[PDB]
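cache lookup: miss for this entity combination. No prior model stored, computing from scratch. Input as submitted by user K.M.:
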Amino acid sequence: TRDQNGTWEMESNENFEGYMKALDIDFCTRKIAVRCTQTKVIDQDGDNFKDKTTSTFHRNYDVDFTVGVEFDEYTKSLDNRHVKALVTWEGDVLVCVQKGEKENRGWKKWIEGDKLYLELTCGDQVCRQVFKKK
Amino acid sequence: TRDQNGTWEMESNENFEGYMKALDIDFCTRKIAVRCTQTKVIDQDGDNFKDKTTSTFHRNYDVDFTVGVEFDEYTKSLDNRHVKALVTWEGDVLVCVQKGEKENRGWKKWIEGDKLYLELTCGDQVCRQVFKKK
């Protein structure tokens, strides 16, 4: 049949790497591409085609802790280091010190209204993230 | 408030790059991380916390065309090249030639049984992908 309409999920993919190398695509772009599942949404009206390809993947980083109990954190998919992490309350702020190779490494986390605030520190570098409640 | 329970979706992220460089993280890992959106699911029981952060990469690539009408394609989900793409029917197979810098570059797309087949060619490298209805 000629009718390709529908939403399609990729089930096998052979020699994706050999093809991307022939296109001279760099190592990192290739690494992202091979991790993605692919969904094709095809809308076909006779000889008129609309093809939307969605590339996606997801990874999880999970930490469990008790306030006041030191725990070993292995920072997988970040810098892959071991730190000794200790979380305390300072007011209504959750404060963590990650003792290890890097000095002044830690974070602070707190709620204000309907937003969660996260400040990640290493050395002189601070990263500030803001999350909104779903 | 001290209640951090819930699902939190990241809305802003400042100096994530400077923080990761202070952790000595390589180019590719830094590249993937800054492109992911972030969702934090926090389960809080007194001072006991579980924080599951999911990092999601998600991109859409849309091509629209009419069979037999040449169109301009910018391959942003692969090698970011401009090609002149022309799609024709060969029987019930959709055949495309992507005219441009790369020699013998094109693809073929067809339905066989109940699955969608996509064969991508550049030079002597062929990639075969198979899709099922989702």
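stored under new cache key. Residues 1-134 of chain B form one domain.
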